[model samples]
Target: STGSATTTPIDSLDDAYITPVQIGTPAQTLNLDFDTGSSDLWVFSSETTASEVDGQTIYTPSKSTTAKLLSGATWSISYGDGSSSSGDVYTDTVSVGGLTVTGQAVESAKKVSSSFTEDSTIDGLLGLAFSTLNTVSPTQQKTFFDNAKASLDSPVFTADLGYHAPGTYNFGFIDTTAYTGSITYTAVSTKQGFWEWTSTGYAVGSGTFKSTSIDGIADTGTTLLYLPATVVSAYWAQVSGAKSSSSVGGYVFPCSATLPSFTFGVGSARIVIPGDYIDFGPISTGSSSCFGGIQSSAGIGINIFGDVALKAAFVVFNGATTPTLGFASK
Candidate 1:
């Protein structure tokens, strides 16, 4: 869409993927993973103490000479996996596509543990989530979208996780070319910043899985797809000789064989989970059971629909035009 004064209705999926935005300078371009689960723009910085840096990828801001830190707002975050990182807020020129937004809010780590400093695969995480979870709140609570919404012609950003290619996690002003057709929007709930769903039933291969009254939470921040233990076990039972193993965290099955395809029907929209995603990996258990992708979280308030499940569809979150979200196929 054109970046003109009039807002355009973005109907393409290509615009959904987050574009690689420059953090410091023209030479240093970082492709950040945009997540809505939590609100925080965390990037590993070279200025951070070496001892504090570990498993996470660190960005060398000193090399660019354009990097700066946000004073008096150093912060830390801990993930469910026990991994943690602490950083200081920084502001610099951030450019995405042809648009350049100055005074962009960002965080640079001051103290990173072994879990975050050692890994060099991802340079940083661009949190496109909600503003309520903003780490730099009160002092700086506005999110990336909050700043870019007015500048965007559409005032909308969509996430189209195109088929797990390198740099599939893309987002920006909505583009319809990447989508199948016009956008199908869903209203956002006011309770919390989550895409809520009430599944009708599961589609196993050709037929739908037995119906059970269960609600699902669509979240971009969560990395893994979670399901109830009973639901997970019931689904696995369909696969013959699918043995259970203690070594694996979840169900184990034969990896060599073709696993059954499962789809979760959200009203009329049917989301099919690719066969490979179900065959997680091989199990160490004596039995020949392979790891089933669906893990049990029976008591969990709401089963999380993580990237694994989200990858199959197009998702758009719009806070600018209206309080609504859109979803479609790739």
Candidate 2:
């Protein structure tokens, strides 16, 4: 059942996102931020050349005796942030939920920049963001989802994002009980490229704050949900009780009290983000207050619905509907 698809070209304005899968015997499940913007599957290796990795979990081959590398293929990916890495390709048995697929291609980086070298939480990424960015030959590559489809409880993969808390990106069945209404469907635009869309803006504390109707993209590669200026400011205002802290300019608050629930209106479907998801951390004085998921992306143009904002509902990216998006309940 081994086959390949030509890399479908997509925009890289957003983060490189992918579903998580388990690789190796007694396999360690690595959360992969797949990017359709690039073509490669890479994980953090024990033989890694950098000081550390960030955000997602990394895989150390030394921990798995069964891991093997491809003979001659070379791989590397560069982001708009001026970060890049290069390494050799390899294949191993990968498990995504119920499916066990073998001979999947992966990269082992030998060189990494400070952006990737500093963070220890992220181990590696799976390039599911777009097929147009694939690095493999047309005849030699396969995606993580392509294999899992055969064994998944269902043929669908659902990403559950938290508002501010850690979100779970589940493969297969989407828990429909998480939401309150019928699932809305939007067609995937073949013309726009990538999973791009226009967000009407966010609704926080029962008030609707409209964005400039800017063009944005949905990115699974990013860990946190990124919103536009007006939307972000409006959200933070509701958390007057939630004070700000020192971060990379992103807001991180105490997850102690009953925070507000926000929603992103995607066309007719209003995606809900719970309070627990927004309560990221504790306040400066350690008072009981919750953090907010709405962060400031001053320069990053696109508003990304990362894991935290995505955990609230089920998402369906229907390649079937060109130029539109599809929504279903988990």
Candidate 3:
């Protein structure tokens, strides 16, 4: 089966893209972030205490006759940003776009971290990562994409993340019209439960492309592009008035600075990130200081190709034998 859904950016946060998803029989619709870095389809639900839930919508399984509690099943998940959630499990019909997965494991959160509770627009998370990363206990749960892959005409999903605009996520098929130029395919190593790939090299603006092979994950949930400290320092060195501030955290530069474009090498293909995208939103209110979209991933232990890097091109997540990633200009 083929299906498509629209994803919209969360205000100026530019941190995540959210799409509508339906759960249970009667369909309790919620706006869920499609996260490639994780594998748990969880939502704020009735199980969560009132104090733990803020302005976000909660899924009520009791309202749907098709929802069945998964006895003795429980799950808990923690993100790289320190946000976390834990809950009981229920099996229900979960639908994304027009594709439906019967008996999908739906983790109903009994508790959510402050970050999630404060983000009222995001009701839950729809994990697009490998099924092996699922957090369910007793028995691992399969993600919606994994459960639906067998019935799909092609085991693929395409992500077209737009800047401050709505983009489309197509499931089971690639919309050729969504991208321009021939797609450049790169083999991915999924041993780490992510769309982990190696970049042949990278370059700052028009500078020479260094042949430093960087290993990173294509994570849609993360906001900024994170790399090694040396690479991050090298890029910031080109920015006038840029500094690695302890107070601000990460590299910060003058908002008016003419930043250079960044490019990453995939096989023989090169994906260039525009200079404008590198200047993340201003650091402080009414201040000329702005945070660099690229930062050091030292503490995180892994480089992340977050929204800042991914939005530069259309991405194809190929789930066929030997999963690969296809990139093309949109």
Name the best candidate (by TM-score). Answer: 3
Ranking by TM-score: 3, 1, 2
How would you order the candidates by lDDT, starting with the best? 3, 1, 2
- Residues 1-330 of candidate 3 have per-residue lDDT tens digits of 988999999887577889999998789999999999999999999989899888888899999889999999999999999999999999999988999899999999999999999898899999989999999999999989999999888999988998868888889998888888889999899898999999888999999999978999999989899999999999999999999988998899998899999999888888999988887768888889999999999999999999999999999999998999988887
The TM-score measured for candidate 2 stands at 0.69
Relative to the true structure, how large is the alpha-carbon lDDT of every model? 0.61, 0.58, 0.91
Model 2, position 124, has a per-residue lDDT of 66
Quickly count the clashes in candidate 3. 0
Q: List, residue by residue over 1-330, the lDDT tens digit for candidate 1.
A: 222111111112211233365776644666555667666777767767877655444566666556666667766677544666667777776655545666777787777667555544455666666666667733855667667777666667665554434223322566667667555565555355455555666756666467665566666655556777777776677787676566655667775577677787655566777766565554554646566767676555668777666766776777754466666667
Q: Number of clashing residue pairs in every model?
A: 30, 61, 0
lDDT score for residue 168 of model 3? 87
Please, what are the lDDT tens digits per residue for candidate 2 over residues 43-156? 776556645455546666656667776777776677645778777766788765455667777677776778766644445666554445555543345566544556565555
Q: Could you report the Cα RMSD, in angstroms, for every candidate shown?
A: 5.9, 7.1, 1.0
Q: Candidate 2: how many backbone clashes?
A: 61
